[PDB]
Amino acid sequence: RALAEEAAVLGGGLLTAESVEQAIAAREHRSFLSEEEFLRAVQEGVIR
Amino acid sequence: REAQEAGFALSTNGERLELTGPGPVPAELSARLEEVTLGSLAASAELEV
């Protein structure tokens, strides 16, 4: 239900496939800072 | 004016209003007396406000 509410917010009032996929992607992206830092460090070569 | 028609008198016994008359008082007179009594109470409250 919470994910559906997020999808409704991102899609206005309709839960289309694009809206739900965007909501899921945004949920994954919100907690992605640690993984973003890991990937950026790997690209930099700090963690090889 | 509309109570003296039957013969009953409107007495202002203190703050509250009563009707003086022999025997029972008519239902219309009682209803109007209660209406004007509530109106007086509300008017006093609104005067204080």
Binding site: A2, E6, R30, S31, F32, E36, R40, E44 | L38, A42
Partner: protein, 244 residues
């Protein structure tokens, strides 16, 4: 029978008294009824009525909520969160009423945004009460232990968007509880670094100008390089604008 007749007279009288009030303020429908009932008792047993005991204790007032009430409470004591129940000391007798309840941050931020601090929230030990208030809706203003009897505040549906603020390690103490994840699901993780780029350099320059400083191009580049140094990364500037 005299008591019953007085009760019936009072009820019939108060029907007309409270009829316009119900239409004017239908949201207070129960309240007036209770007050009506109290006046009914005033008829039956002759008990007196204390005006200071039956009065609408106002707590907040917003013009149009633009901006909406943003009540920042960096503190997390129960008196700061749910308010406190002020009392009257009559020679050593504690006695409070509806009018002596102080509004709290929760009451101050209804319909708006409540901003707290997770570190303070866990350090003050009021996390459990805050969780109960957010989930159900019940709030308990602080009652003095010397009080003969406090006021039981009925639960009400909360309408504020609580936005906690804290360090990532501070929220660890709350993240263990699964109930924390149920109330809060939007984690706005702030990036400790920013991508060092000319666009971000210009953004930093504009931000510093908005701060009220006068800076040259060379000074701006020096600040940019120092910000990169504080992040100890060649491709990232330190996002901590306070240090800059």
């Amino acid at each position: 029978a005299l008591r019953r007749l007085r009760r019936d007279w009072a009820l019939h009288y108060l029907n007309n008294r409270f009829e316009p009030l119900f239409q004017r303020f239908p949201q207070a429908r129960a309240y007036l009824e209770a007050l009506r009932a109290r006046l009914a008792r005033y008829a039956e047993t002759g008990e007196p009525l204390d005006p200071a005991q039956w009065r609408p204790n106002l707590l907040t007032s917003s013009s149009s909520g633009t901006p909406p009430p943003i009540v920042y409470e960096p503190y997390a004591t129960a008196p700061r969160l749910f308010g406190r129940l002020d009392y009257l000391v009559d020679r050593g007798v504690w006695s409070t009423n509806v009018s002596l309840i102080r509004p709290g941050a929760v009451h101050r931020a209804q319909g708006g945004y409540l901003i707290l601090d997770a570190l303070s929230l866990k350090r003050e030990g009021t996390w459990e009460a805050f969780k109960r208030a957010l989930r159900n809706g019940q709030v308990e203003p602080v009652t003095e232990p010397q009080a003969p009897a406090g006021l039981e505040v009925e639960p009400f549906p909360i309408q504020m968007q609580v936005i906690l603020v804290g360090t990532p390690e501070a929220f660890e103490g709350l993240e263990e509880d699964p109930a924390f994840s149920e109330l809060f699901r939007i984690r706005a993780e702030f990036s400790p670094t920013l991508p060092a780029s000319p666009e971000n350099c210009t953004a930093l320059g504009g931000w510093l100008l908005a701060q009220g400083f006068q800076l040259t191009q060379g000074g701006l580049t020096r600040l940019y390089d120092e910000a990169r140094r504080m992040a100890e990364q060649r491709d990232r500037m330190d996002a901590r604008l306070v240090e800059i």
